[PDB]
């Protein structure tokens, strides 16, 4: 449906870390959802085999 | 007698396949490789990656040559006639060598 759940974006950080000759940092962003509907709001089916 | 209907190659609809483009010195630098990657999209999956080697996203590509051969066979008499060495000032010299 149109606002099947809510969707909280955090911010980026990064992990500055040096492995063997060579600069390894990872990002992440942390997140969250919550469905605001009451009673079921999303359904599927299997259409084909 | 009969013409010859020539046919030009960008006109053509296969034209549309491959890029075309005149590279001049090509015969003289493809004496080695040119070796150009192009790329790879990488879906960000959750969870830490491990901090080691397999973060190869950027397969390569190494050139090929290929080459086009014609034979244009000429006559013994057409130069002798072409080159004005076989000539008199003749008439009929003047005109076989038309």
Redesign the interface.
């Known amino acids: 449906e149109k606002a099947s759940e809510s969707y909280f974006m955090g911010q980026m950080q990064v992990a500055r870390?040096e492995?063997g000759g060579g600069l390894?940092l990872?990002?992440?962003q942390p997140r969250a959802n919550v469905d605001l509907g009451v009673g079921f709001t999303a359904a599927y089916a299997a259409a084909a085999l | 007698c009969s013409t010859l209907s020539l046919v030009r190659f960008l006109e053509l609809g296969l034209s549309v396949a491959c890029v075309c483009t005149k590279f001049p010195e090509l015969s003289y630098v493809a004496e080695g490789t040119i070796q150009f990657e192009v790329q790879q999209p990488m879906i960000?999956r959750d969870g830490?990656?491990p901090?080691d080697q397999p973060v190869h996203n950027y397969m390569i590509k190494r050139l090929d040559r290929r080459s086009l051969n014609a034979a244009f066979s000429i006559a013994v008499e057409a130069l002798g006639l072409i080159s004005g060495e076989n000539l008199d000032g003749t008439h009929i010299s003047s005109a076989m060598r038309l």
């Open positions: 870390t492995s390894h990872q990002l992440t | 960000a830490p990656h901090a």
